[PDB]
Amino acid sequence: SKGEELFTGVVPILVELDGDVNGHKFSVSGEGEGDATYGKLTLKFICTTGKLPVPWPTLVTTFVQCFSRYPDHMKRHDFFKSAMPEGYVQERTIFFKDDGNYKTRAEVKFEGDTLVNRIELKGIDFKEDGNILGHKLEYNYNSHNVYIMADKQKNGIKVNFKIRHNIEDGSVQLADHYQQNTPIGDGPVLLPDNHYLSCQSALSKDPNEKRDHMVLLEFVTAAGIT
Numbered sequence: 001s002k003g004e005e006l007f008t009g010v011v012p013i014l015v016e017l018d019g020d021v022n023g024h025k026f027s028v029s030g031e032g033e034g035d036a037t038y039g040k041l042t043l044k045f046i047c048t049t050g051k052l053p054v055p056w057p058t059l060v061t062t063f064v065q066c067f068s069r070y071p072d073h074m075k076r077h078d079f080f081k082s083a084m085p086e087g088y089v090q091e092r093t094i095f096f097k098d099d100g101n102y103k104t105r106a107e108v109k110f111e112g113d114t115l116v117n118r119i120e121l122k123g124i125d126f127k128e129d130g131n132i133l134g135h136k137l138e139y140n141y142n143s144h145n146v147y148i149m150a151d152k153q154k155n156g157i158k159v160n161f162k163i164r165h166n167i168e169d170g171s172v173q174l175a176d177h178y179q180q181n182t183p184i185g186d187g188p189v190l191l192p193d194n195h196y197l198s199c200q201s202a203l204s205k206d207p208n209e210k211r212d213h214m215v216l217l218e219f220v221t222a223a224g225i226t
Contacts, residue, residue: 001190003084004075007036007066012114013043015063021123022100022133024053030063032216034115036081039069041218046211054123055137056214057165060201061094061177062104064117065146068197068220077192077225079148079157079181085110086185088156094163097174100126109184131165131173138166139203146197146220155189156182195224 015030032043045056045063052059066080080088087109094102106119126133142164151158159179164172183189197220204215 001075001078001082002187003066003081004078006084006110007034007081009037010035011067013041013064013067013117014111014114015043015045015117015119017059017062017119017121019119019121019123021054021102021121022126022128024133025049026053028052028059028063034064034067036067036069039067039220041067041216041220044206044209044213044215046209046213048211050212052212054132055135055165056139057137057141057203058096058102058132058175059121059214060141060203060216061163061175062092062102062106062119062121063216064108064115065090065197065220066108066115068222070222074195074222074225076190077148077195077222079190079192082188082190083181083183083185086183086187088181088183090179090181092177092179095176095178096126096130096132097176099130099132099173100124107184131167136168137173138168140166141201141203142166143198143200146199147194148192148196149194150191151180151182152191154180154182155191156180157192193225195222197221198223 030045163175
């Protein structure tokens with residue numbers, strides 16, 4: 001497809017987010033590269049306003065599914081790359097069980113040769129002593145399946161999945177994700193049959209970085225269709 005050819009090699013990525021969670025305002029800037037041929041992403045995020053007021057793992061899903069590896073036989077189901085270079089709007093509501101919710105609006109598109117994800121995040125109803133504002137989540141990330149369906153009504157897709165964040169006491173903090181993606185351009189896009197993305201993420205720290213940050217290595221592959 002049109003956008004498909006934009007991802008045959010290594011593509012630089014920029015992520016910029018402005019957030020407000022229970023009145024705690026912050027910004028994050030991320031840089032890295034993606035190689036969709038291997039469904040691979042490598043990025044480093046830096047909180048530019050000081051200390052991040054929520055745990056880094058809670059922001060991983062918000063911080064470019066166009067880098068997912070779609071097997072050749074599933075290429076016709078790749079909505080994400082088909083919307084490029086004009087891009088798409090990605091919106092989510094993330095419900096943290098027994099706690100608050102994040103509402104995000106992002107625009108993902110190319111600026112020159114660079115794939116950019118610009119995000120605005122609003123978080124409300126969090127408990128000051130909860131797992132999020134209380135910073136009780138382990139600095140790690142589990143593997144998950146992301147379920148995708150077509151949304152012919154909006155010429156886009158609807159996505160849903162459950163993320164399980166590990167709590168320091170051994171328990172788990174569920175974060176239910178509801179997502180919608182709609183093209184920015186008026187060009188045609190690929191509406192997919194139901195399928196899912198299999199994801200895995202590894203979080204680490206740059207030993208020489210004194211600013212609050214997160215290093216992320218991620219692999220994602222589309223599946224569910226033979």
